[PDB]
C-alpha cells in the first residue's frame, strides 16, 4: 500500500458575513446568509471522513461562486468588486502550527480556502491509498484526486497569488516556493500509483525504470524548492522527500539493471543492482531518521515489501548469466561507479488537471450589489481548530 506524508489542514475563524446597516435589502441579505452557511458547510466537510469528491466539489462550487462576488465585477470581470476589502479573514498554515495570519482581502480567503480544498484532495487520496485492499478503481480515484489537487495548487500560484496586496512570508502557505512544492509532490505521488500498477501488470523494465527515475527527480525538485525554508518547520517534510528520492532511485537502478542484463552487459548490471540495494538500505536509514524528526503532520511508515522480491530474482538471473565473467561472488571487474541514469519516461508522467474557479454567482446582480451600501458603515473570533486524527 501507499504511504504519503501529510501536513495538517489549514484552520480559520468563522465568518458571519453580518454587515448590519450596510445591507439594505432582501437580496443582499440572502447572499450574506448563503455565504455564511455555505462557508460553514464547506469547513465542516474537511473533517468529515464520509465526504467524497462529488460532495466536496459541490460545496466548493457553492462557496466559491458566491465568494467570487466580493472579488470579480458582475459581467465586467476585468473590473473589481467594491466588496473586496470589506471582510477580514484569518487562516493558519500547514507548517506554522496554530499561529494564524490575517488579511482583509477576499482574495486571501479565496486562495486559502482553495489551498484547503486541494489539501483535502491529497488527503482523500492518501487515506484511500493507505487501504491494503485497494482496488483498481480506487487507485484511479487516488491517481485522479492527486491530479485535481495539483491543478488547483498550480492555478492558485499562477493566476491568483500575484493579486494579493501584501506578500506572504517565507514559510507561509501562499508563497510561490511552498505551493510549487505541493504541486510537484502531488505529481510524484500520482506517479507512485502508476508505478505500482506498471509493476503489477508486468510492464517493460525500461518503462518502469524511467518512471521511477523521473519520480525520484520530482522529489529531489520538491526538496530543493523547500530548501529555502527554515529547517525548524520544513525539516520532517524534507526528510521525507529525501527518503522518497532514495526509495525510487533504488527502483530506477533495480529495473535499469534488468535492462543492462537483457543487453548482455554484466558488470554494470551487477553494479546497478548493487547501487539499488545500497540505495534501498540508505532509504531505510533516512526512513526512521524521518521518524525521529519532529515536524508538522503524523509520521508515516511504508508497508511495501516488494523491492527485495524483485531484486532477488534479478540478482539470481544476473549471476546465472554473468558468472564465468564477473561472478560467482567476489566480483570483477565491476565498474567503480554506478552507471549514470539518464532516463526519460515516455509513459506514466503526470500533468496537473487544469483548474479554474466557478464564475461569479448568478445571484450577484447590480441591484443586489447596490443593496450593499458601503456609506452605511460607522473584537474578533479565533480560528476554530481543525482537529483531525
Amino acid at each position: 500500500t501507499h504511504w504519503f506524508h501529510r501536513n495538517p489542514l489549514k484552520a480559520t475563524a468563522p465568518v458571519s458575513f453580518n454587515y448590519y446597516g450596510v445591507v439594505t435589502g432582501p437580496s443582499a441579505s440572502k447572499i450574506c446568509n448563503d455565504l455564511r452557511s455555505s462557508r460553514a458547510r464547506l469547513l465542516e466537510l474537511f473533517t468529515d471522513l464520509s465526504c467524497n469528491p462529488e460532495m466536496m466539489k459541490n460545496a466548493a462550487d457553492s462557496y466559491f461562486s458566491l465568494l467570487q462576488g466580493f472579488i470579480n465585477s458582475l459581467d465586467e470581470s476585468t473590473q473589481e468588486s467594491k466588496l473586496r476589502y470589506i471582510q477580514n479573514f484569518k487562516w493558519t498554515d500547514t507548517l506554522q502550527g496554530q499561529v494564524p495570519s490575517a488579511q482583509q482581502d477576499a482574495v486571501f480567503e479565496l486562495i486559502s480556502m482553495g489551498f484547503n480544498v486541494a489539501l483535502w484532495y491529497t488527503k482523500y487520496a492518501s487515506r484511500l491509498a493507505g487501504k491494503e485492499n485497494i482496488t483498481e478503481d480506487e487507485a484511479k480515484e487516488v491517481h485522479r484526486s492527486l491530479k485535481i489537487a495539483a491543478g488547483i495548487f498550480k492555478h492558485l500560484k499562477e493566476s491568483h497569488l500575484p493579486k494579493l496586496i501584501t506578500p506572504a512570508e517565507k514559510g507561509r502557505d501562499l508563497e510561490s516556493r511552498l505551493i510549487e512544492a505541493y504541486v510537484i509532490q502531488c505529481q510524484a505521488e500520482a506517479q507512485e500509483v502508476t508505478i505500482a500498477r506498471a509493476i503489477e501488470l508486468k510492464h517493460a523494465p525500461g518503462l518502469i525504470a524511467a518512471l521511477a527515475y523521473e519520480t525520484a527527480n520530482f522529489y529531489q525538485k520538491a526538496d530543493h524548492t523547500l530548501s529555502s525554508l527554515e529547517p525548524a518547520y520544513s525539516a520532517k517534510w524534507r526528510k521525507y522527500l529525501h527518503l522518497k528520492m532514495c526509495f525510487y532511485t533504488a527502483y530506477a537502478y533495480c529495473y535499469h539493471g534488468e535492462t543492462l542484463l537483457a543487453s548482455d552487459k554484466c558488470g554494470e548490471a551487477i553494479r546497478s543492482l548493487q547501487e539499488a540495494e545500497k540505495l534501498y538500505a540508505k532509504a531505510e536509514a533516512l526512513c526512521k531518521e524521518y521518524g525521529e524528526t519532529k515536524g508538522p503532520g503524523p509520521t508515516v511508515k511504508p508497508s511495501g515489501h516488494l523491492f527485495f522480491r524483485k531484486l532477488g530474482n534479478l540478482v539470481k538471473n544476473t549471476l546465472e548469466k554473468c558468472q564465468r565473467e564477473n561472478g560467482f561472488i567476489y566480483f570483477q571487474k565491476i565498474p567503480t561507479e554506478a552507471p549514470q541514469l539518464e532516463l526519460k519516461a515516455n509513459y506514466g508522467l503526470v500533468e496537473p488537471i487544469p483548474f479554474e474557479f466557478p464564475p461569479t454567482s448568478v445571484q450577484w446582480t447590480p441591484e443586489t450589489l447596490a443593496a450593499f451600501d458601503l456609506t452605511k458603515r460607522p473584537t474578533k473570533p479565533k480560528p476554530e481548530e481543525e482537529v483531525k486524527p
Binding site: K140, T194, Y347
Partner: peptide, 17 residues
C-alpha cells in the same frame, strides 16, 4: 484512447498490453 504519438494508453498513461 490514444497519446500524442498515436499509441493506445490506459487511464494511468501506460500503454495497453
Amino acid at each position: 484512447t490514444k497519446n500524442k504519438d498515436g499509441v493506445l494508453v490506459d487511464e494511468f498513461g501506460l500503454p495497453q498490453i
